Amino acid sequence: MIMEIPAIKALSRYAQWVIWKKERDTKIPYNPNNGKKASSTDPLAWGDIDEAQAGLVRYGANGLGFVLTKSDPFVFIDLDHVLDENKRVKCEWARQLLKEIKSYTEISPSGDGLHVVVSGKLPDYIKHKTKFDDGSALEVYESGRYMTITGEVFDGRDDIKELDLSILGEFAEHKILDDEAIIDLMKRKGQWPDAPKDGDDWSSLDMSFANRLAFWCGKDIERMDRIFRQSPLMRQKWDRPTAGSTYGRITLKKACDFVDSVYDPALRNESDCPFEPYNE
């Protein structure tokens, strides 16, 4: 019955289909022809819709997916946690977006979200992901991404439409070594902290982790801060004022004065790190 939907017929023109399966709370995309993990950049890792339907039953995956590319005309709008227990919209922002972007809408696989597929072009000044106090989120992509396909047509909106997408500027937020290189380096060296557990002096985990950052970042106080904000030790206390400074900066500066050596990127002195790896 899926191939009856006009929008699914439109997507089946493209050999950009995959299948996905729930690992933990992630949704990994897989090559429908052989079952390997599918890249989002390798077109030969995908298949057409017939191969995705066949591969779905073969490996028992959770459902179909569609990879978005620059040259196809589609735009993927992801609305998370915007539906009731009986699948009506409970967020007023999502209610207004659906009024001004009337195109193919379907219920996402968790039942509490929506997908809208539109032909158009995204504004270049908006963030990919926008999070709201409500707990909902708006995530938009036109390439370098795949979308789960359910066919659960919402509100009978079963047709991809050609719409202007400047209206998204009213919903998404606007937007104007290497940090990730250091993060991966610290992870591989066993120096990336685990999330704090019950009965853990979080403030003491902060300081220990901040000491390591002082080494691996070369006491680059602004880099240590950018990296700390992506760690499982980040919390609202980090930016609370304390004596004409924030708790986060007082921690980072204390670490910079505590640590003696520094990791020189050009010297590879990983053996100079004075802190033992995080046990597992």
Give the interface with ligand DGT as residue ranges (CB under 6 A). 26-28, 40, 78, 80, 108-110, 113, 139, 145-148
Decide if 257 is catalytic. no
Choose the binding region for Mg ion from 8-16, 108-116, 200-208, 268-276 (rule: CB under 5 A): 108-116
Give 230's strand partners: none
Angle in degrees, CA 215, 219, 222, rounded to 5: 125
Decide if 139 is catalytic. yes
Catalytic position from the list 139, 152, 159, 173: 139
78 annotated among ligand-binding-site residues: yes
What's the token pair of residue 207? 């300081």
Q: Which does residue 110 bind out of ligand DGT, Mg ion, none, counting CB within 5 to 8 angstroms by kind?
A: ligand DGT
Give 67's strand partners: 146
Per the listing, tokens 């700390």 go with 228
Per the listing, tokens 């921690």 go with 251
Per the listing, tokens 């047509």 go with 153
Told to check if 78 binds Mg ion by CB under 5 A, we report yes
Exactly one of 16, 29, 47, 80 binds Mg ion (CB under 5 A); that residue is 80
The Cα–Cα gap between 199 and 50 comes to: 53
Q: Which of residues 185-214 bind Mg ion (CB under 5 A)?
A: none
Least distance to ligand DGT from the beta carbon of 246, Å?
32
What's the token pair of residue 167? 């209206």
Told to check if 72 binds Mg ion by CB under 5 A, we report yes
Residue 245, number of CB atoms within 10 A of its CB: 11
Catalytic position from the list 78, 106, 142, 206: 78
Catalytic position from the list 51, 106, 115, 142: 115
133 annotated among ligand-binding-site residues: no
Decide if 81 is catalytic. no
The Cα–Cα gap between 269 and 159 comes to: 59
The Cα–Cα gap between 101 and 120 comes to: 11
Residue with Cβ nearer ligand DGT (40 or 96): 40
Decide if 270 is catalytic. no
Nearest Cα neighbor of 231 from 261, 191, 262 is 191
Q: Which residues are annotated as a binding site for Mg(2+)?
A: 78, 80, 108, 115
Q: Which residues bind Mg ion (CB under 5 A)?
A: 68, 72, 74, 78, 80, 108, 113, 142
Catalytic residue positions?
Answer: 78, 80, 115, 139
